[PDB]
Design a protein around this ligand. Structure first.
Ligand SMILES: Nc1ncnc2c1ncn2[C@@H]1O[C@H](COP(=O)(O)OP(=O)(O)OP(=O)(O)O)[C@@H](O)[C@H]1O
Ligand SMILES: [Mg+2]
Ligand SMILES: [Zn+2]
Lengths: 649, 358
DNA sequence: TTTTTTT
DNA sequence: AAAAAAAAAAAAAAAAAAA
């Protein structure tokens, strides 16, 4: 009744108190006006409030929002729409666009406290309350438009008529439903023709979010909840992403309370009407002094080996492996020619070696360090289920392709463990994706080519229990040469038994096991923790807090922390696209001609494709030192690394 | 019942402007009368309209301060209503045939003459216009240089991707781009259904535009307005009207798919003479009308507000390349003369296949 | 002759 | 009143093959 008006005017007072939101609104309006008829991006009618300020202004209204959003959000949206309308000034508008009546729905950010949950913890007492849940994206439905308000016209009268349709999931408040029957007859029998181009249709997409399996109980499976989002943000993100969504948690549907029940133990449906979505990402931007620090690091003479040694400090030796991983994480550029089709651009590396020499650990470190990565095991995967799947979406009854494992990691990296222990059939699929980086699915009436430009890192065991150094290298490996020649770099690791190295590695390992988390005593085990205090988050150049990276003093050479290294990788993969020159060409061709005719024993035969590997390694090393041109020093280091990886020191 | 709103549009002035444009247009005399004349001679079977002419005519008549509004804007905002207006305008201003006609072949006109000489002779019904039209109406999108000619942003075109189409584009005229994957066969589609009621004078006609309908059972003639029917009525295939129909779907190109995504699809309905103007496996630029489709065909009773969408074709650019089956022409003749003058050929051809591989 | 692997 | 089914994953027995 009048409570709506009182809440609306109170919200108007609150909006008038602060000036940031009005500035955002006028910026949106001026951008929209500037994009009208000036020689494609548009800004949706959404503004984000920080309910910390709302709490600091009024506790009653804040509590009403966080306890019963149904009676509080719509008045706020109405007041915001009224303010936007008053600020709006369009003397000469259009005709079909002016009748949109976009209500400017809201988004939230700030500290929630006891209303930030997980998909397992959601239960009955949390219904009808605004919440914010974290999780992983499991699957997404198809974008489908739905109708809201139609427009009719009658030739005789010349009076346009409109009817508005709303459903349970359309609005937060339950109202008497209206069927989708088009009214085509007037009250006096006039004929009414539906007017498309004047009616209202909004997008609709359903997704399902799942709890992260790492934070799971003892011997229990991950669980998932249902999320509906519409209008804007309708197709953000994708399956296999860490997200945090804020929305209203409400129940819908009769659930069998009517005569349609068939058993006593029926239930009800539960569902989330999402308001806003944030990329959790367990942040991705660069500050001014961040760029200054990256530049001052890059201009140093010895950045590359510092970065290499910075990877996984708890693994002893394997320096060349660390360098190879560093070069692989930021590989060379793609080449496409109008006549030459496409050339592969990144690097692939394979590991074969004797048991218990820290290959899986390094692979796990690469998983954690890289931006986008997916973990696969040879015995736990099926080739057909790795690339695509033919499944039928529930709502539409139509069968649509489901993205496979390595397709999700396009442009990323995929790590495979127990590679040689995989079924041979699946192997052929790998060859396909190593041939032209494209997978084709022709089955059940679907013919489509899917892009997959990911890089592969894998480790495999020798045929015997341990590597035999006196035998043919092909004799020690169970994989055919057809796919082994595809891999750019192959490494053989063996634990030579020397008492000096034994003592050194023993000291290192014993140093590792004596570690205590900061701020925690040693008498009790590690416990679970709560999420960050704020559900949503966000003097320069004089502090160098984490810039130098040397967290503790253990060696004269410097070290850098993981976040700074990831920031460096992010900057390098975008801001520089180097080009090679003739001096590196001369060095590379000389080394290739020499290696081709050295005519001595070697781990693997060489062919023309190794020159491509040299080119891409030189490009990657130029990317490392942040130069737009490739100099002969990178050719030298690439040649040295190749000689180490194939000849042996 | 239904609330009312005020809109700036009014179709009377639009119809008058349409008729004025059609009659008075100067690009042979007027072009549109030139088309309509050969239409009258049963020579042209489909009419295609260009809005560039409309835009340039409106702009050049704007030099005199009489015009108050513009048409292409409302055309872009809504299309089917303007198709009906154009068909009405054409039927009002239809010229007489300037040539003789093989008049015996038109069996439908024979049936019409029989019905007229049956009913009017006893003292007659106005037949619906759709039952008589021999022509199809097609629209063509504009060209960007024409938009560059003037300051206004009369653009359209802009070949959006499959996934770039949102729910706000329903009812407009939009252009898509992609590869055609599936093409169905050609089947007849009903437009007007004619019955016969065992000599009931006039024979009832009805029209259906929806993809489903219901038939008639008892006619409204006076002898059957009597308590019992003068002979049961049956559907007549010969008198009814049909149009060629076909269905195709298009798929997004790989280049336009964002990373980590699966390409989507879009259906297309094609009618009239434009049927069989495209084959599976080719890149095209299709311009059409983005229309909704009711879900009641599924008959699931769910999806109270959810509906499916489709596109109706208007003008297709085949694009890609033509094999032409080495069809002879002057240019290829001088090309082969140049080849003969080249002397030794096979070595050059071998050198020119794959220079990438040394 | 026996065990393995594929249908 | 009816969505009902092609596509996958997993468990055997028979036959043939290699040592
Ligand atoms: N240089 C090293 N520094 C630190 N730990 C090491 C080193 N070499 C081996 N280890 C230890 O050896 C153990 C071997 O574990 P892990 O299974 O990851 O090895 P692996 O060589 O990948 O073996 P597998 O082939 O069986 O998977 C780990 O606990 C690891 O800490
Ligand atoms: Mg291991
Ligand atoms: Zn009859």
């Amino acid at each position: 009744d009048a409570v709506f008006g009182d809440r609306v005017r109170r919200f108007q007072e609150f909006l008038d108190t602060f000036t940031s939101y009005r500035d955002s609104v006028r910026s949106i309006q001026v951008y929209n006006s500037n994009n009208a008829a000036n020689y494609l991006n548009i800004l949706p009618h959404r503004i984000i409030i920080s309910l910390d300020d709302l709490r600091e202004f009024d506790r009653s209204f804040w509590s009403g929002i966080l306890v019963e959003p149904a009676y509080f959000i719509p008045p706020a949206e109405k007041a915001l729409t009224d303010l936007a309308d008053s600020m709006d000034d369009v003397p000469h508008p259009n005709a079909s666009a002016v009748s949109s009546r976009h209500p400017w729905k809201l988004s939230f950010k700030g500290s929630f406290g006891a209303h930030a949950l997980s998909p397992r913890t959601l239960t009955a007492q949390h219904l009808n309350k605004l919440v914010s849940v974290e999780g992983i994206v499991t699957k997404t439905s198809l974008v489908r438009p739905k109708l809201i308000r139609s427009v009719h016209y009658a030739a005789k009268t010349g009076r346009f008529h409109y009817r508005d349709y709303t459903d349970a999931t359309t609005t937060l408040t339950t109202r008497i439903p209206t069927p989708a029957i088009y009214p085509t007859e007037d009250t006096e029998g006039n004929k009414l023709t539906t007017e498309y181009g004047y009616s209202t249709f909004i997008d609709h997409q359903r997704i399902t979010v799942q709890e992260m399996p790492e934070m799971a109980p003892a011997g229990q499976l991950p669980r998932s909840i249902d999320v509906i989002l519409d209008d804007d943000l309708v197709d953000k993100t994708k399956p296999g992403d860490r997200v945090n969504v804020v929305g209203v948690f409400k129940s819908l549907g009769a659930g069998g309370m009517n005569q349609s029940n068939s058993n006593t133990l029926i239930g009800f449906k539960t569902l989330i009407l999402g308001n806003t979505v944030y990329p959790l990402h367990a942040r991705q931007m660069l500050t001014d002094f961040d760029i200054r620090n990256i530049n001052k690091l890059s201009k140093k003479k010895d950045i590359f080996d510092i970065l290499s040694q910075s990877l996984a400090p708890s693994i002893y030796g394997h320096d060349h492996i660390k360098k190879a991983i560093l070069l692989m994480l930021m590989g060379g550029v793609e080449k496409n020619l109008e006549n030459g089709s496409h050339l592969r651009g990144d690097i692939n590396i394979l590991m074969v070696g004797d048991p218990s020499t820290a290959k899986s650990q390094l692979l796990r470190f690469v998983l954690n360090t890289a931006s986008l990565a997916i973990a696969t095991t040879g015995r736990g995967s099926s080739g057909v289920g790795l690339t695509a799947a033919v499944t039928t979406d529930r709502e539409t009854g139509e069968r649509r392709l489901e993205a496979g494992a390595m397709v999700l990691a396009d442009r990323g990296v995929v790590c495979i463990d127990e590679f040689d222990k995989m079924t041979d059939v699946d192997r052929v699929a790998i060859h396909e994706v190593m041939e032209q980086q494209t997978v084709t699915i022709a089955k059940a009436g679907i013919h489509t080519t899917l892009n997959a430009r990911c890089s592969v890192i894998a480790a495999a065991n020798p045929v015997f229990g341990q590597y035999d150094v006196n035998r043919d290298p092909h004799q020690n490996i169970a994989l055919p040469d057809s796919l082994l020649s595809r891999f750019d770099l192959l490494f053989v690791v063996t634990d030579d038994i020397n008492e000096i190295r034994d003592r050194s590695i023993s000291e290192h390992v014993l140093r590792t096991h004596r570690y205590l988390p900061p701020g925690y005593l040693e008498g009790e085990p590690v416990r679970e923790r709560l999420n960050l205090s704020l559900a949503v988050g966000e003097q320069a150049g004089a502090k160098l807090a984490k810039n130098k990276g040397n967290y503790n003093g253990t060696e004269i050479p410097k070290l850098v922390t993981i976040p700074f290294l990831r920031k460096y990788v992010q900057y390098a993969k975008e801001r520089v696209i180097p080009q090679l020159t003739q001096e590196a060409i001369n060095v590379i061709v000389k080394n290739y001609t020499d290696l081709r005719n050295d005519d001595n024993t070697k781990k693997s035969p060489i062919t023309a494709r190794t020159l491509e590997t040299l080119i891409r390694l030189a490009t990657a090393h130029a990317k490392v030192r942040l130069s737009k041109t490739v100099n002969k020093v990178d050719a030298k280091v690439a040649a040295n690394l190749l000689r180490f990886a194939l000849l042996g020191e | 019942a239904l609330p009312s709103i005020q809109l700036p549009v009014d179709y009377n002035n639009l119809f008058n402007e349409i008729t004025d444009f059609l009659v008075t247009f100067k690009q042979k005399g007027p072009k549109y009368m030139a088309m309509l004349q050969k239409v009258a001679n049963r020579e042209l079977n489909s009419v295609i309209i260009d809005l560039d002419d409309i835009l340039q005519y409106q702009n050049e008549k704007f030099l005199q301060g009489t015009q108050a509004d513009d048409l292409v804007s409302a055309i872009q905002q809504n299309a089917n209503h303007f198709t009906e207006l154009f068909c009405r305008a054409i039927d009002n201003n239809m010229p007489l045939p300037t040539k003789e006609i093989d008049y015996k072949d038109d069996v439908l006109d024979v049936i019409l003459n029989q019905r007229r000489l049956r009913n009017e002779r006893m003292l007659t019904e106005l037949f619906p216009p759709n039952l008589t039209r021999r022509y199809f109406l097609y629209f063509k999108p504009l060209s960007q240089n024409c938009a560059r000619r003037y300051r206004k942003k009369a653009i359209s075109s802009k070949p959006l991707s499959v996934r770039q189409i949102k729910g706000d584009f329903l009812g407009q005229l939009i252009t898509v781009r992609g590869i055609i994957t599936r093409v169905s066969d050609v089947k007849p589609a009903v437009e007007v259904i004619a019955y016969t009621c065992d000599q009931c004078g006039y024979e009832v006609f009805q029209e259906v535009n929806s993809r489903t309908f219901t038939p008639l059972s008892e006619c409204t003639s006076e002898e059957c307005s009597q308590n019992q029917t003068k002979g049961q009525l049956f559907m007549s295939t010969r008198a009814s009207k049909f149009s060629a129909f076909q269905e195709c779907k298009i798929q997004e190109l790989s280049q336009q798919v964002p990373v980590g995504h699966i390409p989507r699809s879009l259906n297309i309905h094609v009618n009239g003479t434009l049927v069989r103007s495209l084959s599976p496996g080719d890149i095209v630029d299709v311009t059409g009308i983005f229309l909704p489709a009711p879900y009641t065909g599924f008959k699931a009773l769910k999806a109270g507000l959810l509906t499916e969408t489709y596109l109706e074709a208007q003008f297709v650019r085949q694009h890609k390349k033509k094999f032409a089956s080495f069809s002879l022409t002057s240019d290829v003749e001088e090309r082969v003369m140049e080849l003969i003058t080249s002397g030794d050929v096979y070595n050059r051809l071998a050198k020119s296949i794959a220079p990438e591989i040394y």
